[PDB]
From Swiss-Prot, chains A, B:
GO terms for cellular component: extracellular space; plasma membrane; side of membrane; synapse; synaptic cleft. An interchain disulfide bond is present in what becomes position 593 of the T isoform. The lineage of its organism: Eukaryota, Metazoa, Chordata, Craniata, Vertebrata. This is Acetylcholinesterase. Its EC number is 3.1.1.7. Disulfide bonds join C64-C91, C251-C262, C399-C518. It comes from Tetronarce californica. Keywords: Cell membrane, Disulfide bond, Glycoprotein, GPI-anchor, Hydrolase, Lipoprotein, Membrane, Neurotransmitter degradation, Serine esterase, Signal, Synapse. It holds the Pfam family COesterase. The gene is ache. Glycans are attached at N56, N413, N454, N530. It is an enzyme of class 3 (hydrolase). Terminates signal transduction at the neuromuscular junction by rapid hydrolysis of the acetylcholine released into the synaptic cleft. May be involved in cell-cell interactions. Changing H437Q: Loss of activity.
Length: 532, 532
């Protein structure tokens, strides 16, 4: 039967799922690691022991333990990101959508969800892989990994809580895909990993880490880069935060052993309840437990790895959204609200800048403010609001990606860059937030092809184009259809630095995406902060 | 007779001079101080002893000893600034143009020439006061003062060479005007001092200095401000330069007495020949001997005087030209030439920045470069050339004047600000230099009314308008004709910061002249340089 697949780990039984008037097979909740529970909490993952009999893979698995957004109860804009299955530490599973009839050896795409490294689920409606698998005829896999303290608590020097275990969870899933996807009709030689935000940072981290490079062929990064200021911490900062978490739970702090044992006796929600108390600064776009530059998963500093070409050389397709910072200003910066136009006073602007670049001294804060203030009209509320939106997006997402892009292209084998700037007609968030962080995902996953979701005919066309760009790239290392008549997405080169806009209008090519601001963020400001 | 005037210093005999088909009286070369020669070189000026008989004031006097421009022999663009009379240390004289018939008590305007404090003459053709005196019916005076080491060599603590004596020369001339102008038909209660560049800085210095304030009524500053970075030095830097001058002439440096005596035995040209060797940095727009913050002529730092309102409160009219920096880039920055379009490479741009802000550390240089580089088109030669032109003009002239303007207006009784941006049709300098430092002077002095000088009919109209604005302001403290139908030059206020463009097009009002760049130069950069 089509729904029965024998893998190196044992037999698995899937389910037939309807998709746009047709059908495909889905193998949901396949285990790829032993549950990281009890004494294994904080530890590197262990491979799942093979099983006898047939594993029932007809339903989604549990989501990993995580902080749950309750800022807007019942609001779909925020709840579409919350776990939609019961949470459990026993959450290391992957999902596979397979075209029907089962292919023999086709293109494989593995999705890595985002969520600031503290949240996320592979089972969200926006990550439903059936549309992409069906429309592009690819085997679509979505993995999972531990987030928050469970996946990133780091006490460097200890083997009980070394840090980066969430990344190792992702690596283990990629190993399982490499070893077994052939049985589902996928070609292990042609695996593209793709993810957004923390998932995009993760993809870049696998490109960098020597121990992950051989597990995939190509990569797609959406609104995320390994060098993002929020994506990693030093082992000293990781240690300080782990100790501070312990201090919040009245743990014995005499030794790592004492600390870890105490943290292991706590129920999941006890760690989550105090997780946010360990941040070193009053800030926005900063998360507690994230990857650590350990000297193992990451051999040396990310910057030196990027500068020396110490990373997997292959093709990459990546990009950013127009208003990456709005989600974060709404949730923490003074003056912003979901139900107002959020025009920002000069003082709230100043407060926002301080929260946005928490690590900056006063000279640094002045540099940023000057760079984003129109002094001919400084009390303009809309300009202050949009300026902050740009500060947050440029600093945390766009400029780090542009730095990654330029460093990468020097050694890589092919780069395609995009600027997604279409605001969905059915967006439930207010207009001031614009093209929000995370909102290109629904187009990548084909949601607009579903009539009941209320997208326009051009948005469905945009979705189909993006899906075919992503899949063709996964398949060939080039998003363009060979011998096609359609407009060509040009290669991003060190010299011309071309990129295309991604929206419902006829393709348009540009060059040097936000160079003015990124020279400020990537070259000048760090020089200023390092000198003063 | 109309050409005979009895003053408190003795009788003076002038000459009748033709002016635009009519005539007026001119009293040229009237002495206002004893010749500052021999043992009086470097000393404060002494008032001229009264004379018996009649002083022949029919011809221009000698010009003060100064460096002479030989960069373009025979070229009128540069030679129109060079002394046009024999040079001599016996050069403290003033000139007066009086309408005919002699008025009884009319508006007085006293001109203070510029020249970077190291050069300048009251006898230049562009400073001919007959047109303005005739057309506006004002008594026009042009004074003179020692420049270079002769007027500004400063060994603070010494009475033989205290510094600032060139400013005291100007003050003595203003005292003579106050005491005697009534005999020429001028009203001592209504004296307006006006000057350009170093002369404009001088005017602002008299506004600041307690010992000069009572000598005039109102002020006009053209492309110059007392706080300009090149207009003054500390007593320590003044001393170092004086000692270095001595070192260049093989002087005994054991004491001030030994140094000064040696400097006094040298012929004028010997000091001038090594004058430029004392600058502390490789730079442009920096001059050797300038005013010193001595604690006497200037009670405290210029900034604290400006901040506390420690200055004469009255009305001021001032402004800048569009391309203040071009003259200086042509003469010293790599890549610029008089006969080429001077498109600047990225490297010459960098070299220019270093010469333009000689006091800046590397972080400072990077800040400036970033602020003026279009990173989307950084190898554009015209943009690099124009960017440097703006760097030089903003830093040395425009932003210091804007800082002066805003500090002044808070305590003053009326401010009128202009932006002169008309390029004369008959300019002999190349097009790339634009509206050059010093080139609004010919319009202020009415040269365009002289047919043989080849100006257009609209330029003559512009000249007449400017002359009437200046004179009406001198007379009333307001450039606008009361009850006129013409467009009104609005008052510059702390709140609205309005200014007008000055050109052949219908008046246009704007606000916050070059605010973006001036916040950089007046607030951010000094904060950066002071911290790092
Ligand atoms: C690094 O990028 C991200 C960081 C956080 C999240 C996402 C994300 O990318 C997006 C798209 C996708 O990748 C998944 C989740 C998304 C959207 C949903 N949500 C958006 C709200 C994030 C901003 C508020 C975060 N919070 C705090 O900073 C904070 C501080 C103290 C206590 C509680 C909180 S919080 O959870 O409200 C969480
Ligand atoms: C502070 O503003 C200024 C500084 C210098 C001058 C003027 C001026 O404003 C204008 C208009 C008016 O006020 C009178 C003279 C003006 C035009 C004529 N000339 C223009 C040429 C100035 C630029 C070159 C100065 N030189 C040097 O920096 C240098 C260095 C070493 C040796 C020799 C020289 S230099 O004389 O060629 C001299
Ligand atoms: C990606 O790598 C391939 C193979 O290494 C590059 O193709 C080679 O290009 C070189 C230089 O032009 C030729 O000498 C070889 O014959 C090519 N090999 C093959 C098998 O095609 C390709 O140019 C690279 N692409 C980019 C954008 O770097
Ligand atoms: C310049 O100073 C004059 C006189 O000090 C100001 O005129 C006075 O304005 C105050 C306040 O409006 C009135 O109470 C007086 O009656 C006015 N005095 C006279 C004699 O007019 C004038 O407003 C000031 N101008 C500016 C721009 O500051
Ligand atoms: C597979 O497991 C799910 C768990 O709820 C169950 O509903 C479904 O009927 C099961 N099917 C088989 C054949 O075990
Ligand atoms: C005034 O002095 C000048 C000096 O050259 C002379 O030419 C002129 O004739 C003199 N006039 C009288 C009356 O002395």
């Amino acid at each position: 039967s089509e729904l029965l697949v024998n893998t190196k780990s044992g037999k698995v039984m899937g389910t037939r799922v309807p998709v746009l008037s047709s059908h495909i097979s889905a193998f949901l909740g396949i285990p790829f690691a032993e549950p990281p529970v009890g004494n294994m909490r904080f530890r590197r993952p262990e491979p799942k022991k093979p099983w006898s009999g047939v594993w029932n893979a007809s339903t989604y698995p549990n989501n990993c333990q995580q902080y749950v957004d309750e800022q807007f109860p019942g609001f779909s804009g925020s709840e579409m990101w919350n776990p939609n299955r019961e949470m459990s530490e026993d959450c290391l599973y992957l999902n596979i959508w397979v075209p029907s009839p089962r292919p023999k050896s086709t293109t494989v795409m593995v999705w890595i969800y985002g969520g600031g490294f503290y949240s996320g689920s592979s089972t969200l409606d926006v990550y439903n892989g059936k549309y992409l698998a069906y429309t592009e005829e690819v085997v679509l896999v979505s993995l999972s990994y531990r987030v928050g303290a469970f996946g990133f608590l780091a006490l460097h020097g200890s083997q009980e809580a070394p840090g980066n275990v969430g990344l190792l969870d992702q690596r283990m899933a990629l190993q399982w895909v490499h070893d077994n996807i052939q049985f589902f009709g996928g070609d292990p030689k042609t695996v593209t990993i793709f993810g957004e935000s923390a998932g995009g940072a993760s993809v870049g981290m696998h490109i960098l880490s020597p121990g992950s490079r051989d597990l995939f062929r190509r990569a797609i990064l959406q609104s995320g880069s390994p060098n993002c200021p929020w994506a990693s911490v030093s082992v000293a900062e990781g240690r300080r935060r782990a100790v501070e978490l312990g201090r919040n739970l009245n743990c014995n702090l005499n030794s790592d052993e004492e600390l870890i044992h105490c943290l292991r006796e706590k129920k999941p929600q006890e760690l989550i309840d105090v997780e946010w108390n360990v941040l070193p600064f009053d800030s926005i776009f900063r998360f507690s437990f994230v990857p650590v530059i350990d000297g193992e998963f990451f051999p040396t500093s990310l910057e030196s790895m990027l500068n020396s070409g110490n990373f997997k050389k292959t093709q990459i397709l990546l990009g950013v959204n127009k208003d990456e910072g709005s989600f974060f200003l709404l949730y923490g910066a003074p003056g912003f609200s979901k139900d107002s136009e959020s025009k920002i006073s000069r003082e709230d602007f100043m407060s926002g800048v301080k929260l946005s670049v928490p690590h900056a001294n006063d000279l640094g804060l002045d540099a940023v403010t000057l760079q984003y203030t129109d002094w001919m009209d400084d009390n303009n509320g809309i300009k202050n609001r949009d300026g902050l939106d740009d500060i947050v997006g440029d600093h945390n997402v766009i400029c780090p990606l542009m730095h990654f892009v330029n460093k990468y292209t020097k050694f890589g084998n092919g780069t395609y860059l995009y600027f997604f700037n279409h605001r969905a007609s059915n967006l439930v968030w207010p207009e001031w937030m614009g093209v929000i962080h995370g909102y290109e995902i629904e187009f990548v996953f084909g949601l607009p092809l579903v009539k009941e979701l209320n997208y326009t005919a051009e948005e469905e066309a945009l979705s189909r184009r993006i899906m075919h760009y992503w899949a063709t790239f996964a398949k060939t290392g080039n998003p363009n259809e060979p011998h096609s008549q359609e407009s060509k997405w040009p290669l991003f080169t060190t010299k011309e630095q071309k990129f295309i806009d991604l929206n419902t209008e006829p393709m348009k090519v540009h060059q040097r995406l936000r160079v003015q601001m990124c020279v400020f963020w990537n070259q000048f400001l760090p020089k200023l902060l390092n000198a003063t």
